[PDB]
Structure formats: C-alpha cells, structure tokens
Amino acid sequence: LNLLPRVMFMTR
Amino acid sequence: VLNVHHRSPSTHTMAPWVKRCFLHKLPTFLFMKR
Numbered sequence A: 001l002n003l004l005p006r007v008m009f010m011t012r
Numbered sequence B: 001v002l003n004v005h006h007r008s009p010s011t012h013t014m015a016p017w018v019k020r021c022f023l024h025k026l027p028t029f030l031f032m033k034r
Helices: A003-007 B016-021
Strands: none
Touching: none
C-alpha cells in the first residue's frame, strides 16, 4: 500500500 | 471501457483533461445531450 505505489506510480 | 466503469472515488482521481474533453466537447460532438 505504501512502498509499491511509489515505485509503480499509482499515487492514490 | 469496462475498467473505467468501475473506478471509485476512493481509488482514483479524475484528471482535468478528461474533465475538459469527455464532458464538454464530445457529448456535443456525438449528440448525447447528457
């Protein structure tokens, strides 16, 4: 929920 | 087109360009009339 949306460029 | 149907407000944020394109120009371009 925190580290992988930083890498994958999800951003909520 | 089935993915954009199930987009919730708590998981995605609607961009300004899809605001200004898919709400004013093309509904008037294809006779949709809201």
